[model samples]
Target: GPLGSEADPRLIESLSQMLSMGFSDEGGWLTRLLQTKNYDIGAALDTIQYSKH
Candidate 1:
């Protein structure tokens, strides 16, 4: 928890909420995905991490 010194409770809460998930890839068809933000489309692409099946 790097939220030791500059700790904001709201930040911790937000991060905690965001991190409380289990990710699994079910043949990429029903897998959860995340992606980096791009400036062109003003939308994000699900940056799915490659997993060794």
Candidate 2:
């Protein structure tokens, strides 16, 4: 199946950007964050920054 083909283009782009920024797929943390934020890229990024502690 084509991955993310049915998802919002913006969300897919946002996830790609996060991965490009050195975030890992380990433990699926980023994936969870993106989901929790309801695909709001900026909010997810802000939460990711906060979670880096």
Candidate 3:
């Protein structure tokens, strides 16, 4: 991942862990989603959170 300066490493790290558990079937989902959000951690987190439903 890019892990750009704008993003917090700790948050991204936690999100990475969550993605592993939630999107285990296809890791690419996380990559694409992040890219689509321009690597905005908050937006990525929102998507991941809602995906549970």
Number of the predicted model whose TM-score against the real structure is largest? 2
- Candidate 2 residues lying further than 4 Å off, grouped into runs, are 1-11, 51-53
Off by over 4 Å in 1: 1-5, 22-53
Return the lDDT, model 1, position 34. 24
Q: Which model is ahead, 1 or 2, in terms of TM-score? A: 2
lDDT of each: 0.31, 0.66, 0.57
Q: lDDT per residue, candidate 2, 1-53, as tens digits?
A: 77642445645766887778766556566666776787766776677556556
Q: How far is candidate 2 from the true structure (C-alpha RMSD, Å)?
A: 4.7
lDDT of 1 by residue, 1-53 (tens): 76424434433433333344432333532222222221211121233344454
lDDT of 3 by residue, 1-53 (tens): 65633445544654565566564315355655666776665676678556666
Q: What is the lDDT of residue 39 in candidate 1?
A: 21
Output the TM-score of candidate 2. 0.53
Task: Output the number of the lDDT-best candidate.
Answer: 2
